[PDB]
Amino acid sequence: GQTKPLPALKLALEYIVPCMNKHGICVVDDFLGKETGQQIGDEVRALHDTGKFTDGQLVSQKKDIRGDKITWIEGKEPGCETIGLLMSSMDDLIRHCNGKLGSYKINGRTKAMVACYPGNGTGYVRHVDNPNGDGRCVTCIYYLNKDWDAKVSGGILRIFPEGKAQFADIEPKFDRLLFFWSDRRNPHEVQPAYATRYAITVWYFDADERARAKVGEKGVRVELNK
Ligand SMILES: O=C(O)CCC(=O)C(=O)O
Numbered sequence: 001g002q003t004k005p006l007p008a009l010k011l012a013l014e015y016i017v018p019c020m021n022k023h024g025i026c027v028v029d030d031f032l033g034k035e036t037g038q039q040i041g042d043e044v045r046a047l048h049d050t051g052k053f054t055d056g057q058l059v060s061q062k063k064d065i066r067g068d069k070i071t072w073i074e075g076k077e078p079g080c081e082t083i084g085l086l087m088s089s090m091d092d093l094i095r096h097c098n099g100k101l102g103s104y105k106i107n108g109r110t111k112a113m114v115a116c117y118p119g120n121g122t123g124y125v126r127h128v129d130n131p132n133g134d135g136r137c138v139t140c141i142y143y144l145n146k147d148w149d150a151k152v153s154g155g156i157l158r159i160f161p162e163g164k165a166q167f168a169d170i171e172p173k174f175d176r177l178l179f180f181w182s183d184r185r186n187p188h189e190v191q192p193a194y195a196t197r198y199a200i201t202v203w204y205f206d207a208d209e210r211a212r213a214k215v216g217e218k219g220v221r222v223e224l225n226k
């Protein structure tokens, strides 16, 4: 009634850029609205019911690392149009930011990794997303879990910013967008989840680090949506 969305340019330049450059972590709640976030949840639940997910441990393994299942979504597939819209919304924010996030020049991204922690106390041990300079500079995560209560269901993303006297507890709440630097500045872990936990991750590529990267689906650079 009295509420209005912030335009992407404003959110980007007045909040995301300052917050990232000071803290290396930035949370945006109510990113897309209830209607759209509910539609994303249905599409992700469809992918799961219909059996499109692959054990994350298979992807990462050579010791148990991660209890999640996953699938990569390009954005344009049948029953994935709203994930496509999500990805375009993320892209619009980054475009407005680009130039002003450290000295990175972002020239692309991965496809969307839709991930599912199927309850049963599953999670992801402490890790750095990009420890060996594979080109990914920013991790962007969108959560879609209605009425999530970490007291009961756990599933917290805990981030340990390198050499800071602080840490961050990020709850995977419905319609929350999360940005953090993908490198060693931000080791993090998904703590045990006791309900079904959904999340959609995209990583953004720095043009320079990417070009110099040494010889997965994490390695494909798509152009940003217009
Ligand atoms: O779902 C999350 O909160 C983070 C998952 C994660 O860190 C990863 O899959 O690399």
Ligand SMILES: [Fe+2]
Binding pocket: 127, 128, 129, 188
């Ligand atoms: Fe991660």
